[PDB]
Amino acid sequence: ALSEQLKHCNGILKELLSKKHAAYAWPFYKPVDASALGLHDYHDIIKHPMDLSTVKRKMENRDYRDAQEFAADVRLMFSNCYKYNPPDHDVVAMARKLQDVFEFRYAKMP
Numbered sequence: 001a002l003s004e005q006l007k008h009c010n011g012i013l014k015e016l017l018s019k020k021h022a023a024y025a026w027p028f029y030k031p032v033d034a035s036a037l038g039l040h041d042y043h044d045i046i047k048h049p050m051d052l053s054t055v056k057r058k059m060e061n062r063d064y065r066d067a068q069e070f071a072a073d074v075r076l077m078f079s080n081c082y083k084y085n086p087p088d089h090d091v092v093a094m095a096r097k098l099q100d101v102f103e104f105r106y107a108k109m110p
């Protein structure tokens with residue numbers, strides 16, 4: 001039985017993957033495939049890749065100790081996007097919008 005706080009995190013994760021946010025969540029569904037995207041410097045710049053499917057697997061495997069560890073992975077995902085891509089890139093605009101959704105509901109932690 002997940003703790004109350006980790007149940008809240010699982011709900012956040014379900015919302016982030018839902019159709020309601022799919023227009024800006026889609027770049028974060030799967031690990032960045034640097035070779036497929038021609039981003040041949042991605043893994044020289046990003047040392048710890050993260051994506052929503054990895055967060056989902058770690059939640060299902062009970063990897064996360066607490067809500068703080070879950071939130072660190074979600075924020076690592078956004079930070080990687082801000083680090084690698086130029087600030088005017090469309091994916092950065094999508095990252096900002098998905099992070100806005102995350103931060104406001106994470107703040108409602110019970």
Ligand SMILES: CC(=O)N1CCc2c(sc3nc(SCC(=O)Nc4cccnc4C)n(Cc4ccco4)c(=O)c23)C1
Pocket residue numbers: 027028032033036037080081084085089090091
């Ligand atoms: C999280 C993060 O930092 N990422 C780096 C940047 C990026 C992605 S996913 C993605 N899709 C596209 S286009 C459709 C696509 O390529 N799909 C695809 C194809 C082959 C293999 N895997 C996929 C998903 N473009 C180009 C573009 C310019 C404006 C919006 O999108 C991207 O820059 C990215 C992840």
